[PDB]
Design a protein around this ligand. Sequence first.
Ligand SMILES: CSc1ccc(-c2nc3ccccc3c(=O)[nH]2)cc1
Ligand SMILES: [Zn+2]
Length: 208
Amino acid sequence: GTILIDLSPDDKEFQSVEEEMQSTVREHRDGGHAGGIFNRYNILKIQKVCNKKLWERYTHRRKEVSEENHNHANERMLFHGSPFVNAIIHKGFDERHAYIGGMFGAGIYFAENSSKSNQYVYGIGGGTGCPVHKDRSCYICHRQLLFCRVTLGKSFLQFSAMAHSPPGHHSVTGRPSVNGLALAEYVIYRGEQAYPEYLITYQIMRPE
Ligand SMILES: CSc1ccc(-c2nc3ccccc3c(=O)[nH]2)cc1
Ligand SMILES: [Zn+2]
């Protein structure tokens, strides 16, 4: 049921998605071990992910959350990196896409910083890097990330350095408490609370 529509680089929607990607790169405490060394990306393609059934699955859940939270879904646009990006865009998020060992429990994790999600494209800790060169910092191989619509509802705030949501909450927010430049990371425990809106194909760029 999924079709992928290419956005033109001239389209305002391409441009605003690229800007969110590029502007939320930061340096990471691993010095680039997991995701590579780079300050920016070469965006090769941005596609909109269209699946009626998956969209309706998302909106149904969004309304349930909204009605439990004074008509406020608390919807965000967040990045997701994963070895399973191809299954997600065809079958939706579910328990098989969860970070079982994540610091907020087994759930599906999203980031404000695109460079955080980039660390998971080739697996946890960057796995063994690109399939072809076994390089976590490969500047040649094409990578993919998702830019997703995520319903947070009432989010449990964790001030820090599939399971269930904390009672009375719909998600967890990991607030950065040491690295003053890091943006927030979020966890949902129901695959229905996210829709994979954009598929972004890119390379990390070697700093000059
Ligand atoms: C099913 S195996 C797996 C494990 C971890 C992640 C992941 N973890 C994150 C943790 C924090 C922020 C973003 C992410 C993120 O974008 N992805 C994706 C898939
Ligand atoms: Zn490579």
